[PDB]
Design a protein around this ligand. Structure first.
Ligand SMILES: O=C1Nc2ccccc2-c2ccnc3[nH]cc(c23)[C@@H]1c1ccc(O)cc1
Ligand code: NA
Length: 284
């Protein structure tokens, strides 16, 4: 069933980078309609349209408790992607506001759910590419979901990585070394980014400890532009890593270091991450 553009009412702009708005779908014109999240393109080049339609088919083929829900598309191309609205916003903002009132056991609940959504995504041969707490959404106290599939690629049939020929804006401080050097993305590079997510969680989003702040201090704050990427590559090749966060249990920190292995084949799988984190949880 269809969404008519005429009945989509604007409420609030939520974020940009396309843009995401809060709308009410109100066919009845008496404001009783469902509140939804709407993504639309702000600069609608032919390349971007075709990227956006691929994003739409990716989100639509996904159905999992820990993946943001597709609801439909509104036509008039200038497509709008209609999705569920998650009112607690991104995990990053949520953790920031509610800091250490979220205990380690709760952090591990979210980490488990992140690994399950990621493992399900991999069974369809999708590489998220932008796994980070700002792209995880909170449905309620007991559930998060993976969002913004903006950067997601499908693996070729005959290959286990996808090579991005002309990169756009890239979250380098979450990127595996092979992604930095050769622009190669794989299930294993998602696992590397997951390690950085787990770091984010255990720092409680303290600004002076964010991945960009720490890596910049390690390479020196005088590095600029593409010299940053050059020094970050050398640093990672020589075992420079993010530190253990204040108060982080030793075993969760081991998992982070394991995901940050230079050797792609030695990084753990999301299936084994979810098993291990559920084991830590039960122990606690
Ligand atoms: O994950 C999203 N994050 C953002 C980013 C910026 C502004 C708002 C949101 C957001 C906020 C609240 N509910 C949402 N549902 C889906 C999205 C979203 C979002 C969304 C966008 C594209 C997509 O493929 C899947 C989800
Ligand atoms: Na609109």
């Amino acid at each position: 069933t269809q969404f008519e553009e005429r009945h989509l009412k604007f409420l609030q702009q939520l974020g940009k980078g396309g843009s995401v708005e809060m709308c009410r779908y109100d066919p009845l014109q008496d404001n009783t309609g469902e509140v939804v999240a709407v993504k639309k393109l702000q600069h609608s080049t032919e390349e971007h349209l075709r990227d956006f339609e691929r994003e739409i088919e990716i989100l639509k083929s996904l159905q999992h408790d820990n993946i943001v829900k597709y609801k439909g598309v509104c036509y008039s191309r200038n497509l709008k992607l209609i999705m569920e609205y998650l009112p607690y916003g991104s995990l990053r903002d949520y953790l920031q506001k509610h800091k250490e009132r979220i205990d380690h056991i709760k952090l591990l609940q979210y980490t488990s759910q992140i690994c399950k959504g990621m493992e399900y995504l991999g069974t369809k041969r999708y590489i998220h590419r932008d796994l980070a707490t700002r792209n995880i959404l909170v449905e309620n106290e007991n559930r998060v979901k993976i969002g913004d599939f903006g950067l997601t690629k499908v693996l070729p049939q005959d290959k286990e990585y996808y090579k991005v020929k002309e990169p756009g804006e890239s979250p380098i401080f979450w990127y595996a070394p092979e992604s930095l050097t050769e622009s190669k993305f794989s299930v294993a590079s998602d696992v590397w980014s997951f390690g950085v997510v787990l770091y984010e969680l255990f720092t409680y989003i303290e600004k002076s400890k964010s991945p960009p702040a720490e890596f910049m201090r390690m390479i020196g704050n005088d590095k600029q532009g593409q010299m940053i990427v050059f020094h970050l590559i050398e640093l990672l090749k020589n075992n420079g890593r993010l530190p253990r966060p204040d108060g982080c249990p030793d075993e969760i920190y081991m998992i982070m270091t394991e995901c940050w292995n230079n050797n792609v084949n030695q990084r753990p799988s999301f299936r084994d991450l979810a098993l291990r984190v559920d084991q830590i949880r039960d122990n606690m």
